[PDB]
Amino acid sequence: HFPQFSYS
């Protein structure tokens, strides 16, 4: 979800 980078 958010931040987008913090999810695979």
Epitope: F2, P3, Q4, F5, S6
Partner: antibody, heavy 119, light 114 residues
Framework: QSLEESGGRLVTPGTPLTLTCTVS????????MTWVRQAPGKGLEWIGL?????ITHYANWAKGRFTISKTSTTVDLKITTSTTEDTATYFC????????????????WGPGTLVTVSL | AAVLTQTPSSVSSAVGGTVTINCQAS????????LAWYQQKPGQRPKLLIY???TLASGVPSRFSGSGSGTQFTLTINGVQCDDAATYYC?????????????FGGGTEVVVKG
């Protein structure tokens, strides 16, 4: 507040390379980082990034040959197998987002380190 | 995939002229407006000029501005100076789930005529 890349050198095609970005003035626990390269006379090209909690994201072109890892003060880029087309200056940069918004940009850059993949 | 088509590839402007550079995204950007612009003096690292399409970054003169949303974005230099001779790049953020998270435009070399 400053970044410094190291590890650039002459590389024989087909062999591995590790670059390092040493961070001064903030912790990577709180700051995402990215690698970008630029072949001589060519444009900037995004390689990949690592989030604060260690999630990695790569450009499709790079997946499976480039690996990013980090400590709280350093971020590395490993090239599995190098080829001539990897000849470039490699930059590390801070990725500008926090827990409230993502500004989208890379707002702190190192000077770059030069990689030469060549016989 | 996701790309930014940056035009022109090169341009020459007299001192005091105006230069606008265009970036067209092949799909909508993350947050609709997460397009940044960088200046790169020859042999030097990139420097952020504009982010979020229109926000002037730290240490950037007021003659630089940006505009756009969705897929069409521009950078304008209003009253070009000799120091503005450089290569400029746009950079878009995309949804990582559907494309590469980021991409750059191909650059624009700006020559300033003194």
């Amino acid at each position: 507040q400053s970044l410094e890349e190291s590890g650039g050198r002459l590389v024989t095609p087909g062999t591995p390379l590790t670059l390092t970005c040493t961070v001064s003035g903030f912790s990577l626990n709180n700051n995402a980082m990215t690698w970008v390269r630029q072949a001589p006379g060519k444009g900037l090209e995004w390689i990949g990034l690592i989030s604060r909690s260690g999630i990695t994201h790569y450009a499709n072109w790079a997946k499976g040959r480039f690996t990013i890892s980090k400590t709280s003060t350093t971020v590395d880029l490993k090239i599995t197998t190098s080829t001539t087309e990897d000849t470039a200056t490699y930059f590390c940069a801070r990725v500008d987002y926090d827990d409230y918004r993502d500004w989208g940009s890379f707002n702190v850059w190192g000077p770059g380190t030069l990689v030469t993949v060549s016989l | 995939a996701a790309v930014l088509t940056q035009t022109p590839s090169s341009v020459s402007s007299a001192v005091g002229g105006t230069v606008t550079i265009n970036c067209q995204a092949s799909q909508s950007l993350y947050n609709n407006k997460n397009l940044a612009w960088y200046q790169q003096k020859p042999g030097q690292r990139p420097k952020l000029l504009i982010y979020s399409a229109s926000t002037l970054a730290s240490g950037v003169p007021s003659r630089f501005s940006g505009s756009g949303s969705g897929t069409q974005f521009t950078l304008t230099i209003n009253g070009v100076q000799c120091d503005d001779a450089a290569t400029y790049y746009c950079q878009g953020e995309f949804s990582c789930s559907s494309a590469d998270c980021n991409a750059f435009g191909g650059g624009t070399e700006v020559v300033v005529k003194g």
